[model samples]
Target: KETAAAKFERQHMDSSTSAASSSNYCNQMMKSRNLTKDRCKPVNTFVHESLADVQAVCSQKNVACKNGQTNCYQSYSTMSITDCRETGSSKYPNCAYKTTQANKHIIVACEGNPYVPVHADASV
Candidate 1:
């Protein structure tokens, strides 16, 4: 069964590539990650940090999430990440995206006994 923590990893983790210079990064990653299935996700982000590092956020200082929950934790240091924004011409079933790479502190929500990342609220 796919848990929230697993889903978050599928949607955001990309530790292999440190840099995303290719313009096709989003177009390729979105589909490969299954975000382009039913409809193109309007916006998505991929973190290029290790899974251990990401999971560690659960132990960091908490902050308010977009939903106003205090369970969210922001990374202490900036991390390499890629943002995928759907282009205006983009359409479902054949999704297209514009990729932007940046270094920022990631904010994510943690839950469960192991206290793992369940949602990526934002990147600051």
Candidate 2:
């Protein structure tokens, strides 16, 4: 059974590679990952850190989320990340994306008993 946590992992986690692929990384990953099945996701970030490390961010300092939730936390350390943004000409079926790589502190919203990340709020 796929829970909300599992779905969040499916949509955000990409920890296999320590570095991003070529410029076409998002174009390929977005499709293969089933993110562009029906509609295009305008923006998404792929973190190049281990799952355990990302999960630990939930234990970091709690901060106010953009949507006014206080359950969000910022990562204690900066990590490698790749942001995939849909191009202007992107269409429904052909979801084109531009890959921008960076190292920054990630912010995520956590919940539940174990206090895991359910939403990738932002990066700074």
Candidate 3:
């Protein structure tokens, strides 16, 4: 069983992501990352940065999360990202997706007592 943190990393981190620039990025990644095991993950992002740098975003922007909640921050540097939107025809174990590659400064949500990051990323 994967821990939430581990799952979070798979769903969000992609430092060595491909620049292949295919629309199939999500279909392959969501499955390869093990995020679409139960149901097709409707939407998600992948961040291209080191874990330490990802953690530092909390203090880097120290503002409300992208959704305007506490314990979140937006990064100052725009990073490479991939947006995965599960295809409409997708259902359950046989899921599908339309993927996109982008470069944008992400809005990262942090957590913990002296919060680090969780789910950790979304670009704006």
Candidate 4:
């Protein structure tokens, strides 16, 4: 018979394995982008993970999500309240703000998943 701790360990390990597998797959997909000598086009990569995890990665990379920042090469989750306030120009105060905004709707493209967009909103 498995002890409670053992069962918990098994469950935790399984979850971690699955998450790692997913992340790894994403990384691989991003790496497949083709590079040209003349013009190096930016490829968009996506990852399916929680908002916290996405934010953590962005923070680690020193990426900022200010206003007028449409092309987030890394990750994009539900725009935060703070983000909405950072309008590029004063004329566009509510440009980023939208009533239809919902949580758990982030889009991220990592180095591996360049073509495929992994919806990480549900992970949050």
What ranges in model 3 sit over 4 Å off? 1-4, 18-20
lDDT of 3 at 83: 83
For candidate 4, which ten residues in a row score worst on lDDT? 92-101
What is candidate 1's lDDT per residue for 18-117, written digit by digit as tens?
9798999999999999999989999999999999999998898689999988899999999999999999889899898999999999999999989999
Instruction: Tell me the RMSD of model 1 versus the true structure.
Output: 0.8
> How many clashes (backbone atoms < 3 Å, residues ≥3 apart in a chain or on different chains) does model 4 have?
11
Off by over 4 Å in 4: 1-20, 35-65, 69-103, 107-124
Q: lDDT scores for all predictions?
A: 0.95, 0.89, 0.75, 0.27
TM-score to native of every candidate shown: 0.97, 0.95, 0.83, 0.19
Clashing pairs in 1: none
How high a TM-score does candidate 3 get?
Answer: 0.83
User: Native-vs-model 1 lDDT?
Assistant: 0.95
lDDT of 3 by residue, 30-101 (tens): 888888876787898877678776777778876666566876678888877888887778888889887777
Query: Taking the tens digit of each residue's C-alpha lDDT, what string does model 2 give over 56-81?
Result: 99998799999998999999999998
Pairs with steric clashes in candidate 3: 111-115
**Residue 119 of model 4: what lDDT?**
23
For TM-score, the strongest prediction is 1
| TM match of model 2 to true structure | 0.95
